Structure formats: structure tokens, C-alpha cells
């Protein structure tokens, strides 16, 4: 019974670390999508500025 309890708690801790690494995957994806967002918005800003200034 001691061996079984040890094995079960080991598996539970493994599941914990697995979910933690899942959340870290998600966080890195979030950061990179935010960088995509900001660069695309910068190019859109340059586009609107050209459109407004060349408006003679």
C-alpha cells in the first residue's frame, strides 16, 4: 500500500507539471500574438498616415 500511494502521488505531481507547461505554451503564444498585433497596427498606422497626407 505504501508503494501504491507513492506511485499515485508521483503521477499527480507529473500531471501538475504537465499542466504548468501547457500554460507556459499558452503564455508564449499570447506574447507572440501581441507582437504580431503591434507590428501590424504600426504598418496600418503608416498606411493611414500616407492616405491622409497624400490627400491633396
Amino acid at each position: 500500500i505504501n508503494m501504491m500511494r507513492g506511485d499515485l502521488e508521483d503521477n499527480l505531481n507529473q500531471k501538475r507539471r504537465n499542466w504548468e507547461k501547457n500554460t507556459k505554451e499558452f503564455n508564449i503564444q499570447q506574447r507572440n500574438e501581441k507582437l504580431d498585433y503591434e507590428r501590424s497596427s504600426h504598418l496600418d498606422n503608416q498606411a493611414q498616415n500616407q492616405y491622409h497626407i497624400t490627400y491633396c
Binding site: 503608416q46 498616415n49 500616407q50 497626407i53
Partner: protein, 420 residues
């Protein structure tokens, strides 16, 4: 971040400032259209760049220059505050009578340009001392802005006339008049002359016909190399205030000499080395500076050396220590370790090293002396006074102005006599 503004007045001021913007654009890699190929420039749509600068004069003829010479499409069209009469070589026309009418608009532009900053590190202005537009408007602007921004500090590259070169016959008047208050509310007056530049381009570069172009190019490159160590990563960084402690022991003894290194012609460039020993031997002499005042006839209260490029800090440090304890007489003894060094990590465009030698010395006091000389022989007889008092400016001021000068030079001589 630690941004700097640019005011350039007068003919010589505008010329040198245009050349300086040219050199900077060629350093940061900015072609005359304002593209790449916050310390000095500001961003603009389509990745364009606007130089942070204000150009002022009482005659718009200089417009021609700043629109003909390269890098003329950079500046802002609202940053051209021009007059119509022209001060015409007279100080009064540009500080009491007419310049006192556009100086307020210049102040408004200064406010509209400084509020766009987030950390304003200081000011830098370039102007003559006899040029009515330059001296008058620049001194009035300095007065106003220092009465406006007491925290910030101004570093003016004023270009004094040395009598060994004759340009106009009323310089001493405007020179002393501007000095009367330039020692008052200015913290770094790096003086420059023309005799030093002529002697340089004759007996140091073997040039055939020394022309204003290359003279201005040299002084502008020196002006850049002065503060470059903040525009880039460095091993021992500096700013416009780490000089304002290492080089101002007293709130008036702030008159600086400037020297640039290295300087050679084509053949000399081929057949010589570029190392700490040679640059040091090149910079501590007399005729590698831009002041017609023989420094070996005085001393240096303090001397900063901004190196540029990449080297071994031990080497430059030992060279500084050695050149000090060998020139112990020509340095001042009542102060310890009167020399300073500062190393960046990026050399200029063209070479692999650079050295800007800035000096708060006690030799240039003599300079004032000689100018004062002419003053007396143009005041004892009250000569050429019927152009000044006829513009509201009371004559009495002039007198006490000269008195003030005395105090200044007195201080220097007094500190040349101190011991422990």
C-alpha cells in the same frame, strides 16, 4: 531620452550648424531626404526624420544657404524664424531694438519644441560674438531660456574673433557686451577662433587654400565628438553634465577650449599609426587646439578627454597618468588628478579612433585681455559709439561691462597663483 535641442543664430552659427547637421546625418546614416541609409532627431510619418533645431536670423539671406547646401530638406518649415531688417553687425539692433521683437516668437518655438521632449538633458547654441543677429539674439535667448529652465544647462559653441585675423572693425564692442552676460548664465562656453583653424589647415594638414567649408567641417566634427559618448554604448559613459562637474570647479570658470584628434593629410594618413600613444602625442600640444592662445603659457585647471572607438582602458589610463606626471608644471598642482577620460564603443564614420580634448584652462584668460585691449582704444576715445547709444541702449552699461570682464580674468590669474 536625454534629448538635446539645437539653436543656431547668425551667419557663422548657421553655417557651422548646417555643416554639423550634415556630419550627423552622415553619422547616423541619414540621407538628405530624412531616411535611414531621439537625441537629435524626431520621428515623422513614413519613417521620416526631423532634426530638432531652430534657425533664427534678422536677414533671411541665410535661408538661401540652408536651402542650397546639402541636407536642407531636413529642417522644419515652421522652425525658420527670420527677420527683415537684419541686425547689420550691430549688437543693439539684435538685442534691444528689433531682436527684442522676434525673440518672443523664438521663445514660443523653443517652448513648442522642448515640451515635446520627455527628458531634456540640456541646450546647445552656436553663434558669433560680433554678429549683431548672432550675438544679440543668441544672448537674449540664452537669458530668457535660463530664466525659464533653471534645471537644464546650456553648452554654447560661441566663436570669438581673434585679432590676429581681421574681419570687422567693431568686434570688441559686441564681444565684450556679450561676454558681460555670457559668463553670467551659461555653463559651457567652448570658444573657437579663426587663426587657430588657419594655422591648423596650413601647418598640420598642408591644405592649399583653407576654405570655410573644411574649417566648418572640422569644428562640426569636434562638436559631435564632444557628446557622442551618449549617442552609443560606452565602457565609461558620459553626458552633458558629467562634463558639467569634471570641468566646472567654480560657477564662472567655465570657458572651455576644444581640440580634435587625429588630423593629417593623405600621405601622412598613409604613413602613420593610429594608437593611444600617437593620439596622445597629437592632442596635448598647442597647435592641435582651436584657440589662438598658447596653452603652455598657462595651465589647465581640468582637462577631459573623450576617446572614441575601441581600446584597452588600461592603455589610455596609463597614458593619461604618464602625460600628467610628466607635464606637472604645465598642470595645476593644488588640485589632484586634474585629468579625466571617457570611452565609447563606436568610432566615427571614416576612421577607427577619435579623441575630443576639452579643457577648462587658465590660459584663455589672456585672450580676453587682448580683446579688452582693443576695447579701451575704442572706448577711451569713445570711437564708434554713435551707432550704439542711438538705439535706446544706455552707454553707462558698457562701462560696467568692461569692469565685469576684469573680475573674470582676475579670477583666472588668481587661481594661477594658488598653492597649498
Amino acid at each position: 531620452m536625454r534629448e538635446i535641442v539645437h539653436i543656431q543664430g547668425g551667419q557663422c552659427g548657421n553655417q557651422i550648424g548646417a555643416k554639423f547637421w550634415e556630419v550627423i546625418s552622415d553619422e547616423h546614416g541619414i540621407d538628405p531626404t530624412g531616411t535611414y541609409h531621439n537625441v537629435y532627431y524626431n520621428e515623422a510619418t513614413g519613417g521620416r526624420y526631423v532634426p530638432r533645431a531652430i534657425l533664427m536670423d534678422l536677414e533671411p539671406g541665410t535661408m538661401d544657404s540652408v536651402r542650397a547646401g546639402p541636407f536642407g530638406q531636413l529642417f522644419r518649415p515652421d522652425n525658420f524664424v527670420f527677420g527683415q531688417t537684419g541686425a547689420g553687425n550691430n549688437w543693439a539692433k539684435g538685442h534691444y531694438t528689433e531682436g527684442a521683437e522676434l525673440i518672443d516668437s523664438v521663445l514660443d518655438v523653443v517652448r513648442k519644441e522642448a515640451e515635446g521632449c520627455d527628458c531634456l538633458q540640456g541646450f546647445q547654441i552656436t553663434h558669433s560674438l560680433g554678429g549683431g543677429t548672432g550675438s544679440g539674439m543668441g544672448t537674449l535667448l540664452i537669458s530668457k531660456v535660463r530664466e525659464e529652465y533653471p534645471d537644464r544647462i546650456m553648452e554654447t559653441f560661441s566663436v570669438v574673433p581673434s585679432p590676429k585675423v581681421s574681419d570687422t572693425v567693431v568686434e570688441p564692442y559686441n564681444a565684450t557686451l556679450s561676454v558681460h552676460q555670457l559668463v553670467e548664465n551659461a555653463d559651457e562656453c567652448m570658444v573657437i577662433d579663426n587663426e587657430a583653424l588657419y594655422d591648423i589647415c596650413f601647418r598640420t594638414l598642408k591644405l592649399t587654400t583653407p576654405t570655410y567649408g573644411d574649417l566648418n567641417h572640422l569644428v562640426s566634427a569636434a562638436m559631435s565628438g564632444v557628446t557622442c559618448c551618449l549617442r552609443f554604448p560606452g565602457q565609461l559613459n558620459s553626458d552633458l553634465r558629467k562634463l558639467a562637474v569634471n570641468l566646472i570647479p567654480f560657477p564662472r570658470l567655465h570657458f572651455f577650449m576644444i581640440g580634435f584628434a587625429p588630423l593629417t593629410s593623405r600621405g601622412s594618413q598613409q604613413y602613420r599609426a593610429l594608437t593611444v600613444p600617437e593620439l596622445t602625442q597629437q592632442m596635448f600640444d598647442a597647435k592641435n587646439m582651436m584657440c589662438a592662445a598658447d596653452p603652455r603659457h598657462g595651465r589647465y585647471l581640468t582637462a577631459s578627454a573623450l576617446f572614441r572607438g575601441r581600446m584597452s582602458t588600461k592603455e589610455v589610463d596609463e597614458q593619461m597618468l604618464n602625460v600628467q606626471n610628466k607635464n606637472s608644471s604645465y598642470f595645476v598642482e593644488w588640485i589632484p588628478n586634474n585629468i579625466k577620460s571617457s570611452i565609447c564603443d563606436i568610432p566615427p564614420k571614416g576612421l577607427k579612433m577619435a579623441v575630443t580634448f576639452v579643457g577648462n584652462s587658465t590660459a584663455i584668460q589672456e585672450m580676453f585681455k587682448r580683446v579688452a585691449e582693443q576695447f579701451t582704444a575704442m572706448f577711451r576715445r569713445k570711437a564708434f559709439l554713435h551707432w550704439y547709444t542711438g538705439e535706446g541702449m544706455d552707454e553707462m552699461e558698457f562701462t560696467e561691462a568692461e569692469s565685469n570682464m576684469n573680475d573674470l580674468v582676475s579670477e583666472y590669474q588668481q587661481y594661477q597663483d594658488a598653492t597649498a
